[PDB]
Design an enzyme around this catalytic site. Structure first.
Site, PDB file in Angstrom:
ATOM      1  N   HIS A  61       0.860  -1.222   0.034  1.00 24.15           N
ATOM      2  CA  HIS A  61       0.161  -0.050  -0.039  1.00 24.15           C
ATOM      3  C   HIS A  61       0.977   1.122  -0.142  1.00 24.15           C
ATOM      4  CE1 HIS A  61      -3.465   2.543   1.639  1.00 24.15           C
ATOM      5  NE2 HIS A  61      -2.609   3.353   1.889  1.00 24.15           N
ATOM      6  N   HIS A  86       1.456   4.478  -2.851  1.00 25.99           N
ATOM      7  CA  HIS A  86       1.684   5.895  -2.624  1.00 25.99           C
ATOM      8  C   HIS A  86       2.841   6.374  -3.294  1.00 25.99           C
ATOM      9  CE1 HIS A  86      -2.021   6.781   0.003  1.00 25.99           C
ATOM     10  NE2 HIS A  86      -1.398   6.090   1.063  1.00 25.99           N
ATOM     11  N   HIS A 109      -5.495   7.594  -1.973  1.00 24.48           N
ATOM     12  CA  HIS A 109      -6.521   6.592  -1.461  1.00 24.48           C
ATOM     13  C   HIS A 109      -7.630   6.543  -2.308  1.00 24.48           C
ATOM     14  CE1 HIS A 109      -4.578   7.195   2.691  1.00 24.48           C
ATOM     15  NE2 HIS A 109      -4.069   6.007   2.246  1.00 24.48           N
ATOM     16  N   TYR A 126      -9.467   2.161   1.992  1.00 28.21           N
ATOM     17  CA  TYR A 126      -9.788   2.109   3.306  1.00 28.21           C
ATOM     18  C   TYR A 126     -10.587   0.866   3.505  1.00 28.21           C
ATOM     19  CZ  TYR A 126      -7.922   6.571   5.199  1.00 28.21           C
ATOM     20  OH  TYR A 126      -6.865   7.569   5.513  1.00 28.21           O
TER      21      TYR A 126
HETATM   22 ZN    ZN Z   1      -2.275   5.069   2.765  1.00 30.59          ZN
END
Ligand code: ZN
Ligand code: ZN
Length: 195
Positions: A87, A91, A97, A146
């Site tokens: 994850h 980025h 996100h 998320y």
């Molecule tokens: Zn993140």
């Protein structure tokens, strides 16, 4: 939520890195597995830093999105697991996100009253100028999505409610086991990878 900004894309798909001398053999091997998982499926390559001014550094300290430029940037690692690092690498490569996509209201509901006070900013949409989805559909399975209760103020209180599909199923969100088909296809478009 792919960055729209050319300056934030790593030139040539190459991301130089340094892994701190403090990490165990096990942690170092895990960082390399997470890097390799992105490499195998895209045209991104991670290389040990030689003389580059801008590079990522793994440090026991979410990551900056894309290449900051003019110097190093941290990928700052209980969050010591493969999927968490994949994850954070998302980025680095240039993804925000998923639930902050400008079109996200067609796909999820944010339940603002269930967010821990002071954490609501994590649920704002990116400005449309800052994300170019590259024609890709909203991806509930993204490694960048998320979970249903991230930043929740309590047990069983959701902060994100995915929309039902035509079969009436609300998709699962928040997996941290592997890149989704959509993360791969979208990263390939972002880096203009050969077919
Ligand atoms: Zn993140
Ligand atoms: Zn996506």
């Amino acid at each position: 939520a792919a960055t729209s900004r050319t300056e934030r894309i790593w030139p040539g798909g190459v991301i130089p890195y340094v892994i701190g001398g403090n990490f165990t053999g096990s942690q170092r091997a895990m960082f390399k597995q997470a890097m390799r998982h992105w490499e195998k499926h895209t045209c991104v390559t991670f290389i040990e830093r030689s003389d580059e001014e801008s590079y990522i550094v793994f440090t026991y300290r979410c990551s900056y999105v894309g290449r900051r430029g003019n110097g190093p940037q941290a990928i700052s690692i209980n969050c010591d697991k493969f999927g968490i690092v994949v994850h954070e690498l998302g980025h680095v490569i240039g993804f925000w996100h998923e639930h902050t996509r400008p079109d996200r209201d067609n796909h999820v509901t944010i339940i603002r009253e269930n967010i821990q006070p002071g954490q609501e900013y994590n649920f704002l949409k990116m400005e449309p100028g800052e994300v170019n989805s590259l024609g890709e559909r909203y991806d509930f399975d993204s490694i960048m999505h998320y979970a249903r209760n991230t930043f929740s103020r309590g047990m069983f209180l959701d902060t994100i409610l995915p929309s039902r599909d035509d079969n009436g199923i609300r998709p699962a969100i928040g997996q941290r086991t592997r890149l989704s088909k959509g993360d791969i296809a979208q990263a390939r478009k972002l880096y203009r990878c050969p077919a």
